[PDB]
Amino acid sequence: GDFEEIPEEYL
Amino acid sequence: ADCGLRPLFEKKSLEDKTERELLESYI
Amino acid sequence: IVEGSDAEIGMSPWQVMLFRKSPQELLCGASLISDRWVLTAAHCLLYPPWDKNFTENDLLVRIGKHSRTRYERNIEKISMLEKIYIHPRYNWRENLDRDIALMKLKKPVAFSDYIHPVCLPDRETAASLLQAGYKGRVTGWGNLKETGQPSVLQVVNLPIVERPVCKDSTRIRITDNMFCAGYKPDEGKRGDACEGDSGGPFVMKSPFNNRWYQMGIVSWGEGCDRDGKYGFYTHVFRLKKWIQKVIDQF
Ligand SMILES: CCCN(C[C@@H]1CCOC1)C(=O)c1cc(OC)c2oc(NCc3cccc(Cl)c3)nc2c1
Ligand SMILES: *[C@H]1O[C@H](CO)[C@@H](O)[C@H](O)[C@H]1NC(C)=O
């Protein structure tokens, strides 16, 4: 979708 | 203690563009 | 938010985005009430008619944001949830009575220029501010129209409406735990929350102590920004005994 990836330390 | 005082507004005594609209409604 | 305007930078530093994982999307708004607690609408997390039932690990809280879709490096803070608490008397079957939930964060968030908690009203705050005609402010990244999506956080100021007019605008049973807000058809001015804004804050700035208080939580509306309809908001003060009880216990 429209969302910029977040640093995957949050994931 | 500091709740509801915005760093970029109340804390520096700056007002945002529409807060006066709310104040004017508070009779 | 329908018929609002772009927020200024730092205008709503208690604004929280609830962000879903897989699939990456806006879940709801929310608000920061301390370094460890976030407030939202229960139906954001649990709503059986729409098969919504999010657990702690399904979502993230994003605090200090302005742009909807960007990862706002060095500005936003992303937090994981430790525990969700839904009001035990949340009425999802009928009318979204007590539409309120708390979320405790795994780790306290650092305050900054962009991240700062909102106050919760006490009984005197409610009695003085929660009056027909008095305006509060609603913010969120929800849809711009009922039937697209904003680039940045949107803001609208809306007047509280008399309880009989609220009641006469809907076939839903409205309780003392709800209030409604928005302009009447002949007031000319427009504005409402919309899909994606639920859970966000309805705030007022007390003219007595010049602080912002979260008086309501964005709950529900019959569509968005329709003539003769209003938005319904959880009455935060009426639910404050529950809020305190939860924070004090956990
Ligand atoms: C209580 C069931 C309400 N309902 C049924 C009645 C019967 C006829 O239609 C209304 C809904 O369809 C419904 C349910 C919701 O959550 C379960 C909603 O959430 C929102 N949020 C977006 C919004 C938009 C305008 C203002 C605010 Cl304050 C918030 N709108 C929702 C609408
Ligand atoms: C998920 O958990 C909640 C707990 O309140 C329950 O109400 C809901 O129906 C559950 N959903 C499913 C699909 O099992």
Side-chain angles (χ1 to χ4, degrees):
Chain A
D2 343 310
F3 296 84
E4 180 180 5
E5 311 279 45
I6 65 170
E8 93 274 47
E9 80 195 70
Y10 300 110
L11 299 165
Chain B
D2 217 20
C3 66
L5 300 169
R6 295 170 291 178
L8 294 175
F9 293 97
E10 289 75 21
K11 181 181 174 174
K12 286 167 93 134
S13 195
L14 294 181
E15 292 160 0
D16 72 51
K17 284 172 197 319
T18 64
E19 62 170 273
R20 186 162 255 127
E21 183 182 356
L22 304 188
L23 179 53
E24 286 166 356
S25 74
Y26 305 153
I27 60 150
Chain C
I1 303 286
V2 184
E3 291 281 331
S5 74
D6 291 358
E8 289 164 69
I9 299 302
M11 196 188 210
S12 189
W14 37 82
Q15 196 80 23
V16 169
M17 174 183 294
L18 298 193
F19 182 68
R20 182 188 195 161
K21 293 176 183 185
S22 150
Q24 289 209 350
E25 65 181 23
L26 171 72
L27 267 202
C28 260
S31 61
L32 183 69
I33 63 167
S34 77
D35 67 355
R36 200 85 181 257
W37 286 92
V38 172
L39 182 68
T40 191
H43 90 258
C44 291
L45 303 175
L46 174 72
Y47 194 62
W50 295 348
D51 301 297
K52 304 285 175 163
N53 189 4
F54 297 101
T55 184
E56 290 75 4
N57 288 346
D58 292 336
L59 48 333
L60 291 173
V61 322
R62 307 180 63 171
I63 316 175
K65 284 194 64 50
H66 179 68
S67 171
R68 182 178 64 94
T69 55
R70 181 179 177 238
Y71 171 60
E72 291 175 292
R73 181 164 56 95
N74 295 187
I75 292 168
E76 72 171 287
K77 292 297 172 298
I78 303 190
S79 305
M80 289 168 63
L81 299 181
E82 176 173 305
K83 189 75 166 148
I84 286 159
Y85 303 88
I86 294 157
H87 200 287
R89 305 182 72 204
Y90 162 53
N91 192 341
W92 51 267
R93 296 186 184 270
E94 185 196 358
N95 57 357
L96 297 183
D97 197 17
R98 310 190 190 82
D99 194 8
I100 186 161
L102 284 160
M103 297 170 279
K104 183 189 189 214
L105 302 183
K106 283 195 179 170
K107 289 193 196 218
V109 73
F111 301 159
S112 71
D113 286 348
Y114 313 100
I115 298 178
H116 196 89
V118 70
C119 306
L120 301 183
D122 60 26
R123 177 172 297 280
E124 297 56 64
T125 319
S128 53
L129 302 183
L130 249 234
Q131 300 197 54
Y134 278 41
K135 290 170 177 176
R137 175 177 289 175
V138 178
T139 42
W141 285 284
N143 294 349
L144 297 168
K145 307 214 154 160
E146 186 186 326
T147 307
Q149 263 139 15
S151 167
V152 307
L153 186 64
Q154 298 296 108
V155 187
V156 69
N157 300 326
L158 295 170
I160 294 168
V161 176
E162 298 82 355
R163 303 190 61 85
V165 174
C166 295
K167 288 182 183 166
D168 284 351
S169 74
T170 179
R171 302 167 67 161
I172 304 292
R173 183 174 65 87
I174 305 306
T175 71
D176 289 348
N177 301 320
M178 299 163 209
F179 69 89
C180 94
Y183 291 103
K184 300 164 182 188
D186 55 33
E187 291 177 320
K189 295 177 189 190
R190 296 201 76 81
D192 200 4
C194 203
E195 193 167 331
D197 291 320
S198 288
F202 179 104
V203 301
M204 299 175 82
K205 182 167 174 173
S206 163
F208 301 93
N209 70 183
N210 299 285
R211 287 185 191 255
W212 294 90
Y213 285 92
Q214 186 178 349
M215 303 310 295
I217 307 163
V218 179
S219 187
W220 64 274
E222 183 174 1
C224 313
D225 198 43
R226 293 190 197 166
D227 286 346
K229 302 302 176 174
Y230 299 90
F232 288 90
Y233 295 84
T234 307
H235 193 311
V236 169
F237 171 68
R238 290 265 303 171
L239 289 167
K240 212 199 182 170
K241 276 202 193 194
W242 176 78
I243 295 167
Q244 209 79 250
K245 198 176 100 80
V246 171
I247 289 163
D248 285 356
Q249 188 166 152
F250 301 105

